[PDB]
Amino acid sequence: MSKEKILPLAARSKKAMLRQPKQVAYFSRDLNYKTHPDRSNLSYYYLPDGDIDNSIDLSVGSKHFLLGDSVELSKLDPILLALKEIEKESGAKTKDRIITWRGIMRKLLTLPYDSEEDFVLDVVSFDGQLFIQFNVPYLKSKDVQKQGDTEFHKKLQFSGYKFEKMATLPKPWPECTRKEIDSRAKSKCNNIEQYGAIVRTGISRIKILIGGAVACTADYYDENDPLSRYIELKTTRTINQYKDMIAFEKKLFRTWAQCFLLGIPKIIYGFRDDNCILRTVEEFSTNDIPLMVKNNPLNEQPKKENCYMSSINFYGAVVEWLNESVKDDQVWKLSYAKRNRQYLVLKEVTDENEKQQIVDSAIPAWFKEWRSELRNS
Incomplete structure (x- = not known):
């Protein structure tokens, strides 16, 4: 056996705090997975009270819903590309340490308290930088097991995507026409068409380059501080009892971990019933979630230990680990599954063929040749 690293779930770093994230790049992923460094897919938020009062259906058009490949969407092509432009117009190597997507860090931070999903991730140490990706065998296993996930889960996913499509506009409201507003329900919904931002964050003595999709922006693009106007949209079931409260608090913690990495201040949530009809909508602030979660009048003292602070501490501990x-x-390959429930496993791979194929499927050829050119120059 190789030198196996055990990360206990109770490991914490009390001196861990998040540095202020700052956006360094943006990109748009089109149908053919061709990343472009512009704002073609950036959308703008617009939803009055009349749409909520009208009881807009969310399940309409689910027959022709398009799906995207897990491998293509999980590839680090856009982040590495934006690295290539920032390297070209910077002239010197960057100061970031771990380079990854937003979802990987979301799951790896949310793991200690919300762990109903197993994950195996590949870590590549190249030129002093870290590349984190989902394991390709794990990707195809996930695709195989997802292909038989009945029809309710895809219905909920399409309901969320339809809410995202219906609540936003492709252009700011003053420049939009009446045709582009009343035809939102007649459009095509898919997950391939997206817009993402790449942001440099920091924690402890570590710099991370996080890539993540952004749903839309508040009213316009702020060139001074783009992250101030960002906004995220999610869909949950209507709340009617204590069990719904507990479920929504768990979902709130998960999506707050998802959103806090990119520094998005505002979040919007459309509550729907079992008939996939938008029942209500409301706002939340990322900084204000922990205080309102803790100071809940119905359940004032469920636990003396705030999950959020320890989640930050665990994130610092794992990132320094x-x-x-x-x-x-x-x-290296790290993993977490049902059988552990106490720790995360990390192993080192020594197979030459496996290492070579992991590197080839993880890093594209153009990035490698550009890195070689930069090292030569």
Whole structure:
């Protein structure tokens, strides 16, 4: 056996705090997965009270819903590309340490308290930088098991995507026409067409380059501080009892972990019934979620220990564990599943063919040749 690293679930770092994230790049992913460095897919939020009062259906058009490949959407092509432009128009190597997507860090931070999903991730140490990706065998296993997930889960996913499509506009409201507003329900919904932002964040003595999709923006693009006007939209079932309260608080913690990484201040939630009809909508603030969750009049004292602060501490502990747990020119695999329930496992791969295929499926050829050119120059 190789030198196996055990990360306990109770490991915490009391001196861990999040540095202020700052956006460094943006990109738009089109139908053919061709990343472009512009704002073609950036959308703008607009939803008055009349839409909520009209009881807009959310399940309409689910027959022709389009799906995207997990491998293509999980590839680090846009982040590495934006790295290529920032390297070209910077002239010197960056100061970031771990380079990854938003979902990986979301799951890896949310794991201690919301762990109904197993994950195996590949870590590549190249030129002093860290590349984190979903494991390709794990990707195809996930696709195989997802292909037989009945029809309710895809119905809920399409309901969320339809809410996202209906609540936003492709252009700001003053420049939009009446045809582009009343035809939102007659459009095509898919997950391939997206807009994302790449943001540099920091924690402890570690710098991370996080790529993540952004649903839309408040009213316009702020060139001074783009992250101030960002906004995220999610769909949950209507709340009617204590069990609904508990479920919604767990979902709130998960999506707050998802949103806080990119520094998005405002979140919007459309509550729907079992008939996929938008019942209501409301706003939330990312900084204000922990205080309102803790100070809940119905359940004032469920726990003396706030999950959010310990989640931050665990995130710091795991990121420093990754910082001084992998050496240069090394490929590792970390995992978490049902059987552990106490710790995360990390192993080092020694197979030459497996390492080569992981590197090839993780890093594209153009990024490698551009890195070689930069090293030569």
